[PDB]
Design a protein around this nucleic acid. Structure first.
Lengths: 87, 216, 121, 129, 60, 206
RNA sequence: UAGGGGAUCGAAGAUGAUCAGAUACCGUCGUAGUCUUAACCAUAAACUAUGCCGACUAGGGAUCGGGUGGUGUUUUUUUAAUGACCCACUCGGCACCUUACGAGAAAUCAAAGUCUUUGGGUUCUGGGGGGAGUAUGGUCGCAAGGCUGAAACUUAAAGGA
């Protein structure tokens, strides 16, 4: 959203569930945003650096999330198995 | 004194947080109220309806005096609450707060002709409570604030300036009416138009960014 | 009756927290003491606080009574906590028992099983 | 019966998407529909979509984004004159900007803003936002 | 209409110049657009009633 | 992850033939388990006898997911158990929770023995009905230890055995762990035995 | 309405009880009717007191009917086979829980939502309370009766939660 001359004219841009590209509308509570993590090449938790992702309320209600992430950090680049795009 | 409570309170006293748009981004809660006192001062109150009830005792009829209160400024910020109480002087009062935790953005914007300086909504919205249905619709320039005395009121405080309206919808219910209308503007933001799709990429939560101040 | 009261309990139950140690059951040695500590109204009230207390230290000893702990009972729970030694190591029946259908995934998953298992109700 | 096709599948697509299905399956395949999606797609509202044939009137998978807000079929299929669409947009499009009403001419199983650059109009089947 | 169509421009550029002649809206605002942000109160200053007042030749 | 000997060695048909874990049940085969070798003409389901080393030791990397095993528990409320799950809590990680489970303990900020896990487990999914539900909630993976008998919706993997009396409830977790530990921990790599008995492991008093 | 059937219940009728009265309640018998063939009538709180088509919104966990997939549960017979089963998924039901972003006079409602931001398609109905669904005509029926449907007069409330 913007003017004639490149002036972002808004309150903000809404944040949008990360697997579901709906919206997160202010006063959700249900509302999470994850901060997993990465290892460094060693049993050491990497600090000040992490992943992210972002759950609606939407799906907390429906069982969903557990299987929605178990798509995504396997789908990203950390996890191996559990999950299948071919059930 | 203020004083504080929770991780969220402490922060804003100190002033590690600045604007209300932090708080709707990460979409926090809010329990304390001063949390938007320090921030938005612009804020002004307004009393819509002071009605008696009643819960009817063994040789009498008890009464309170629902008030219902609306708050905000001009810029995309409405507040709304409904605290019965007994005597007016809790009843308004700790209405005024009831509304303040319920501050809610809006997402003034364009009719068409982009031009320069928002006057109307972005899009069509609807709301529903029990009976009332509100169909807010974006109107071109100073067309006007097309509605009942009260709706006008809400919608002024929330500038916004111009927009067609319509009801259904028993709107001798001043209370179920506002309930509703409110739940629509609070829902401009809860509607994907092309101009959002450009994926924004998550900041980092206050709840562990100033983790230490946030506690003893 | 004979049925105790808040003001009283909740005055002994606050007390019993700090002063378990001066602490007793000869209640006539608490009575005196229970003034140097609380800042009580009355003489009657005071004689009904300590009555209750002695109904704590006469059952405390007998055992773990409820929703009250005073840095002395809570350190006998980091002392009673812990235990069984050796931890789980089978030799005696070595091979550790592994349903006999417990060989497929973990033939499709590791390194060394010293396992126990049901050749087929 | 099934008395009408496009409708049936469309409705399920605003009842997949609501729940957050990432997709869909829909039965009776048409040309009509193939064309319909091919409009939607150009405009950024779905992707890919992987006909399947079975020698029959046939089945079609439509992979998601989670953008779709809403795509009702209109439905007699009324008639329409050029300067008339100017009544529709604002009776079923949230804005103007945006979000395409959509219609069927001669070219064209093609929206209205492209219609200007063509200057044509006939009957108006679905609409997107 | 679109923008650019014969009717829209002509009136606009005829519409507008009728209001430039009456002082109502400025030069600098006339795109079209914009005439909409004209409230009652602008017209009133261009009533003779008051333009006299401002040209003082009048106590109040 | 195909390795080497986690593979059966010289004794994995000898030691569960005196304990029964290939066995199923009476007139009962629950649509919800590959987890029944046929099914005989005289009585009874000869649980498939090769695929519990398939979803009782998913069940050991999934964790390997603990950085800190006392979260790695054992879920229960039986009699023959309170002497294997209490006990899965001792020799490694975990609050035992047999007897009191502690309802909530995973719904709801208001209780006592406080939970906020990421893969819990669960003896009898007829006795342990609240890792299937206290999970169909919000974000708490589960793992039922799925006899011919275990509603399978939402305990997403299989863990089959036999519980019609006797031993193998407790004496079966034992295998979840040993082989979870031989990914990560402190024991040792074909064999140099394993210093208990499966005949410590049984009762404490009737 | 005319034949058949006429166990049991059981208006009507008779009764004995109770009762100031009791033509009612309570009890025992009881034509007619309940049942059926063949022909009428068309009303009901015919009730979700919620027109149907559609299209879109927010979570669940059940179930009936299908269908798809899982070296899925037993069946054991030798492995299968099916079948019951489990679970995964779905489309179509018949409902239910929970929220309230909405709606409402509220009670409550996934529809009574998308309605003063007032408009997807169309058929019926109501406009104070009675008088009265009567009097009248007109009509369907053998009759009971239905559908149609006034006005004069009267009245400041009748009503909903």
């Amino acid at each position: 959203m913007e003017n004639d001359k490149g002036q972002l004219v808004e309150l903000y841009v809404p944040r949008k569930c990360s697997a579901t590209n709906r919206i997160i509308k202010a006063d959700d509570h249900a509302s999470v945003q994850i901060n997993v993590a990465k290892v460094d090449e060693e049993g050491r938790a990497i600090p000040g650096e992490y992943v992210t992702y972002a759950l609606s309320g939407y799906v907390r209600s429906r069982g969903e999330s557990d299987d929605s992430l178990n798509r995504l950090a396997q789908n990203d680049g950390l996890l191996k198995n559990v999950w299948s795009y071919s059930r | 004194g203020w004083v504080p409570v929770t991780k969220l309170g402490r922060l804003v006293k100190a002033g590690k947080i600045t604007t209300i748009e932090e708080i709707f981004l990460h979409s926090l809660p809010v329990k304390e109220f001063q949390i938007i006192d320090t921030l938005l001062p612009g804020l002004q109150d307004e009393v819509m309806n002071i009605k008696p009830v009643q819960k009817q005792t063994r040789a009498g009829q008890r009464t309170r005096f629902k008030a219902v209160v609306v708050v905000g400024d001009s810029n995309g910020h409405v507040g709304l609450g409904i605290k019965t109480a007994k005597e007016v002087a809790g009843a308004i009062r700790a209405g005024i707060i009831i509304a303040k935790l319920s501050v809610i953005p809006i997402r003034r914007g364009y009719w068409g002709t982009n031009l320069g300086q928002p006057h109307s909504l972005a899009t069509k919205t609807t709301g529903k409570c029990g009976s009332v249905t509100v169909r807010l619709i974006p109107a071109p320039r100073g067309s006007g604030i097309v509605a009942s005395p009260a709706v006008k009121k809400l919608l002024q405080l929330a500038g916004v300036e111009d927009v067609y309206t319509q009801s259904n919808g028993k709107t001798r219910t001043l209370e179920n009416t506002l309930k509703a209308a409110f739940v629509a503007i609070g829902n401009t933001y809860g509607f994907l138009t092309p101009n959002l799709w450009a994926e924004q990429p998550l900041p980092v939560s206050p709840l562990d960014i100033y983790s230490d101040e946030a506690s003893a | 009756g004979r049925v105790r009261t808040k003001t009283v309990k909740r005055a002994s139950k606050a007390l019993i927290e700090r002063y378990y140690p001066k602490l007793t059951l000869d209640f006539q040695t608490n009575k005196r003491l229970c003034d140097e500590i609380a800042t009580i109204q009355s003489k009657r009230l005071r004689n009904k606080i300590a009555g209750y207390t002695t109904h704590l230290m006469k059952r405390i000893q007998k055992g773990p009574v409820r929703g009250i702990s005073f840095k002395l009972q809570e350190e006998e729970r980091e002392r009673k906590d812990q235990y069984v030694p050796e931890v789980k190591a089978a030799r005696s029946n070595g091979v550790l028992n592994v349903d006999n259908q417990t060989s497929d995934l973990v033939k499709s998953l590791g390194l060394k099983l010293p396992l126990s298992v049901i050749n087929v109700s | 019966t099934r008395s009408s096709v496009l409708a049936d599948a469309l409705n399920a697509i605003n009842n997949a998407e609501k729940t957050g299905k990432r997709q869909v399956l829909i039965r009776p395949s048409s040309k009509v529909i193939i064309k319909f999606l091919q409009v939607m797609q150009k405009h950024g509202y779905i992707g890919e979509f992987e006909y399947i044939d079975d020698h029959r009137s046939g089945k079609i998978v439509v992979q998601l984004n989670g953008r779709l807000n809403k795509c009702g079929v209109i439905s007699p299929r009324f008639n329409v004159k050029i300067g008339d669409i100017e009544k529709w947009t604002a009776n079923l499009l949230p804005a103007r900007q945006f979000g395409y009403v959509i219609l069927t001419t001669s070219a064209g199983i093609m929206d209205h803003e492209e219609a200007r650059r063509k200057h044509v109009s006939g009957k108006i089947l679905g609409f997107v936002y | 209409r679109d923008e650019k169509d014969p009717k829209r421009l002509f009136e606009g550029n005829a519409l507008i110049r009728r209001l430039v002649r009456v002082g109502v809206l400025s030069e600098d605002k006339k795109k079209l657009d914009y005439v909409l942000a004209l409230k009652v109160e602008d017209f009133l200053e261009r009533r003779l009633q008051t333009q006299v007042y401002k040209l003082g030749l009048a106590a109040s | 992850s195909l390795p080497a000997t986690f593979d059966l060695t010289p004794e994995d048909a000898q030691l569960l033939l005196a304990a029964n874990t290939h066995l199923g049940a009476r007139n009962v085969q629950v649509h919800q388990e590959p987890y029944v070798f046929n099914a005989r003409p005289d009585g009874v389901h000869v649980i498939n006898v090769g695929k519990t080393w398939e979803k009782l030791v998913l069940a050991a990397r999934i964790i390997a997911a603990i950085p800190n095993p006392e979260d790695v528990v054992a879920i229960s409320s039986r009699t023959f158990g309170q002497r294997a799950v209490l006990k899965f809590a001792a020799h490694t990680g975990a609050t035992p929770i047999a007897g009191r489970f502690t309802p909530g303990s995973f719904t709801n900020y208001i209780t006592r023995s406080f939970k906020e896990p990421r893969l819990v487990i669960v003896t009898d999914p007829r006795s342990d009905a609240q890792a299937i539900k206290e999970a169909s909630y919000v974000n708490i993976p589960v793992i039922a230890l799925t006899d011919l008998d275990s509603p399978s919706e939402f305990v997403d993997v299989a863990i089959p055995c036999n519980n019609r009396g006797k031993h193998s409830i407790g004496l079966i977790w034992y295998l979840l762990a040993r082989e979870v530990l031989r990914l990560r921990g402190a024991l040792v790599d074909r064999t140099q035995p394993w210093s208990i008995m499966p005949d410590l492991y049984f009762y404490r008093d009737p």
